[PDB]
Amino acid sequence: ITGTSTVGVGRGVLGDQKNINTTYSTYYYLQDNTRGNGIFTYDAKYRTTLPGSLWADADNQFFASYDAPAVDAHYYAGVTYDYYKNVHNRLSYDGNNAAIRSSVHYSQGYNNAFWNGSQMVYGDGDGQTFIPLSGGIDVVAHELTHAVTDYTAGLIYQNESGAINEAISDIFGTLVEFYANKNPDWEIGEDVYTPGISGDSLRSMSDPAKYGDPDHYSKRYTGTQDNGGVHINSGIINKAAYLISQGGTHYGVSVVGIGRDKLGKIFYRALTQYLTPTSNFSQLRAAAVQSATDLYGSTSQEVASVKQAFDAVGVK
Numbered sequence: 001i002t003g004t005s006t007v008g009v010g011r012g013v014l015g016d017q018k019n020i021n022t023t024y025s026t027y028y029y030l031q032d033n034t035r036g037n038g039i040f041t042y043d044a045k046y047r048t049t050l051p052g053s054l055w056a057d058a059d060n061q062f063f064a065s066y067d068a069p070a071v072d073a074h075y076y077a078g079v080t081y082d083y084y085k086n087v088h089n090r091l092s093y094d095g096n097n098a099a100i101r102s103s104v105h106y107s108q109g110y111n112n113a114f115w116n117g118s119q120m121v122y123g124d125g126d127g128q129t130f131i132p133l134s135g136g137i138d139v140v141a142h143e144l145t146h147a148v149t150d151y152t153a154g155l156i157y158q159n160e161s162g163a164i165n166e167a168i169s170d171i172f173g174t175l176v177e178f179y180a181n182k183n184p185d186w187e188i189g190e191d192v193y194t195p196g197i198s199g200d201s202l203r204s205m206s207d208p209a210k211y212g213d214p215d216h217y218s219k220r221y222t223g224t225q226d227n228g229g230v231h232i233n234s235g236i237i238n239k240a241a242y243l244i245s246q247g248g249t250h251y252g253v254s255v256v257g258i259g260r261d262k263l264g265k266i267f268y269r270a271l272t273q274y275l276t277p278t279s280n281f282s283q284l285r286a287a288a289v290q291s292a293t294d295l296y297g298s299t300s301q302e303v304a305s306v307k308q309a310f311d312a313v314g315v316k
């Protein structure tokens with residue numbers, strides 16, 4: 001909408017107060033004009049028609065329970081935009097400052113979130129399996145990274161290319177969580193999963209097998225569920241990325257860690273310059289090795305650690 005940029009205040013899903021960029025024109029809207037062509041957050045009003053209505057509020061204060069998922073979808077989209085711009089010199093998900101659109105209160109008791117090719121969508125959860133999923137900065141950045149992938153490699157969402165697609169979203173979701181530096185970890189979704197259970201999460205990058213996901217190519221899922229295991233076999237690539245950053249010895253293979261910033265640079269370059277819609281795991285290894293060669297040199301530690309990490313998870 002056309003209006004003047006303002007700053008509201010509210011509480012997120014976890015009860016934390018934050019300021020949010022809004023727009024005033026009769027109402028205060030969840031429209032952040034400070035980032036690209038805008039960040040826009042919508043109310044889907046428990047239906048599945050999208051996007052719903054641009055979020056409007058009478059007083060620019062967002063402290064109601066119903067407001068909390070919108071506050072966090074809006075704010076964490078902004079943090080994710082800031083990460084890609086400041087760290088990778090990428091302007092929004094298309095590299096040309098495309099408007100970022102999110103809808104919250106999607107359906108009733110919906111235990112998921114997604115990028116639909118046009119916008120981000122967040123369920124509220126059923127209150128037992130999940131609380132509203134925009135409360136997780138790693139989840140929000142996971143979804144926005146699917147959009148980045150859509151405009152770059154275009155990894156098909158099936159089998160190995162889909163598991164790379166998923167792992168890319170978990171990797172950059174986690175790197176955004178570290179960027180914001182509030183309780184960062186290598187787990188996915190811990191802030192919104194199972195409010196009745198402390199210490200768990202949807203997935204672990206540091207130890208995927210904690211939640212039954214494979215951590216070695218020899219243990220990959222080969223059936224048809226989950227689009228051929230895209231959220232299962234992502235564990236193999238997530239573990240490799242974790243090893244590249246943090247190091248460790250895994251199935252007897254030692255990896256020298258090179259840190260999160262270099263992990264992000266290597267995988268961002270792989271995603272944007274080498275991966276294609278049908279890339280498989282072996283091709284991802286080749287893209288990551290080439291990317292680290294470009295950035296650090298063929299004889300570099302960084303290149304050696306990428307090779308070790310893929311060796312450790314059985315990907316040649």
Ligand SMILES: CC(C)C[C@H](NC(=O)CNP(=O)(O)[C@H](Cc1ccccc1)NC(=O)OCc1ccccc1)C(=O)O
Pocket residue numbers: 111112113114115116117142143146155156157165202231
């Ligand atoms: C218990 C759950 C929460 C755990 C897991 N989900 C996630 O970890 C986060 N959602 P997510 O993985 O982001 C989304 C999943 C989806 C797919 C289809 C329909 C609805 C939801 N995919 C997604 O948005 O794909 C984007 C894409 C679009 C086009 C091409 C390629 C990818 C699960 O769904 O099992």
Ligand SMILES: [Ca+2]
Pocket residue numbers: 057058059060061062063
């Ligand atoms: Ca209000």
Ligand SMILES: [Ca+2]
Pocket residue numbers: 177182183184185190191
């Ligand atoms: Ca965390």
Ligand SMILES: [Ca+2]
Pocket residue numbers: 138174177184185186187188189190
């Ligand atoms: Ca996390």
Ligand SMILES: [Ca+2]
Pocket residue numbers: 190192193194195196197198199200201
């Ligand atoms: Ca929990």
Ligand SMILES: [Zn+2]
Pocket residue numbers: 142146166169
């Ligand atoms: Zn995903």
